[PDB]
Amino acid sequence: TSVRENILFGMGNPLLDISAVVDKDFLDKYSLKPNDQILAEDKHKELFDELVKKFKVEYHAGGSTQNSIKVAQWMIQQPHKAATFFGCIGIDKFGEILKRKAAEAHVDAHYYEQNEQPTGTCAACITGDNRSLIANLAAANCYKKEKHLDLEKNWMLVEKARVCYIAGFFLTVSPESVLKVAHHASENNRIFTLNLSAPFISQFYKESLMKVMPYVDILFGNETEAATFAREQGFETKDIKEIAKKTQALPKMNSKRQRIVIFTQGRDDTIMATESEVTAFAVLDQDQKEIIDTNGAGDAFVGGFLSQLVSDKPLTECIRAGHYAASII
Numbered sequence: 107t108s109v110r111e112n113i114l115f116g117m118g119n120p121l122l123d124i125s126a127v128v129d130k131d132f133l134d135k136y137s138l139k140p141n142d143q144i145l146a147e148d149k150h151k152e153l154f155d156e157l158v159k160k161f162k163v164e165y166h167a168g169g170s171t172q173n174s175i176k177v178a179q180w181m182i183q184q185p186h187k188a189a190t191f192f193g194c195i196g197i198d199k200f201g202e203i204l205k206r207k208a209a210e211a212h213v214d215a216h217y218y219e220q221n222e223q224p225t226g227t228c229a230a231c232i233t234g235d236n237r238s239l240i241a242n243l244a245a246a247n248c249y250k251k252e253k254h255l256d257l258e259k260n261w262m263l264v265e266k267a268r269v270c271y272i273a274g275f276f277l278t279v280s281p282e283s284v285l286k287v288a289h290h291a292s293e294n295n296r297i298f299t300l301n302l303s304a305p306f307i308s309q310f311y312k313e314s315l316m317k318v319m320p321y322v323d324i325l326f327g328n329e330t331e332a333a334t335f336a337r338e339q340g341f342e343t344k345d346i347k348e349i350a351k352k353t354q355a356l357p358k359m360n361s362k363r364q365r366i367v368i369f370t371q372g373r374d375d376t377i378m379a380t381e382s383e384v385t386a387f388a389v390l391d392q393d394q395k396e397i398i399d400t401n402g403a404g405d406a407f408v409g410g411f412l413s414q415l416v417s418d419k420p421l422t423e424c425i426r427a428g429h430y431a432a433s434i435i
């Protein structure tokens with residue numbers, strides 16, 4: 107093996123995933139479309155506490171960036187604490203559970219804990235054939251870099267790292283801290299990776315997303331996200347195989363590393379753009395998966411891919427583990 111700890115740093119919104127099995131007489135209370143993912147409003151406050159009661163649940167350390175780092179450590183059977191992760195949580199039992207589920211993943215998590223807000227949480231409300239998801243960010247959105255990421259002891263773990271990845275959802279929380287990490291990857295010429303996460307980031311956080319873009323070694327994104335990203339910046343093309351070209355020719359601050367743009371397409375090829383020219387890799391099929399996680403499998407692609415890049419392997423092999431990873435899920 108001989109891979110080393112804290113070799114891959116990650117950072118993002120730690121969400122505590124709470125799945126179970128409900129019905130509808132539990133959903134109509136809070137009125138929720140059987141298969142839809144939205145954000146929690148002040149009329150959903152209880153829905154959390156009332157999902158740990160009347161329903162048998164599992165507790166997984168969730169959130170995109172955190173999902174990707176745990177899958178990267180899974181494919182990283184050894185050593186342990188090979189991947190690190192910073193985020194904000196609350197000082198309540200939910201955060202207690204999160205701290206636990208992550209160590210129980212050999213992930214080296216180091217959280218910014220606080221009281222103001224509860225630990226965030228995502229709610230898996232499955233009726234078997236649906237996915238009503240309720241997300242409440244809370245604590246994940248209170249991260250303070252000056253009192254956590256800026257501290258010597260944690261910042262030294264960002265130093266032990268030779269690869270950084272942050273899902274773009276985190277730009278909605280702290281671009282200043284996304285930046286300190288990206289910038290640093292430049293100054294010490296290490297790899298810094300990023301996710302477009304959702305089309306809304308490209309449409310509504312472009313200023314923050316363009317500030318880090320020059321400091322972005324690799325870029326992860328999907329079909330649609332790719333699509334909207336081009337729409338704004340003015341690429342004109344609608345051809346993904348082309349967008350990957352126009353984007354990756356974007357002003358890259360560090361010039362010592364030319365960039366790689368991996369645009370996934372759900373389960374259907376993968377478009378990589380490098381300094382040379384654009385190729386395309388077809389996916390591993392697992393046909394007629396009615397259960398197909400689909401949404402949230404791109405997080406798994408990213409972990410598997412990351413697991414192979416922390417060892418500087420052929421991009422073709424990083425993309426191989428991306429499929430091994432997405433999915434066991």
Ligand SMILES: CN(C)c1ccc(-c2c(N)ncnc2C#Cc2ccc(N3CCOCC3)nc2)cc1
Nearest residue numbers: 119121143144145169170171239240241275278306
């Ligand atoms: C679809 N929902 C459930 C959804 C999607 C994705 C996430 C998500 C995940 N998976 N992992 C980590 N962070 C976030 C996060 C986050 C997040 C979501 C939305 C948002 N805004 C949307 C409205 O405009 C203001 C910015 N800002 C931040 C959570 C919830």
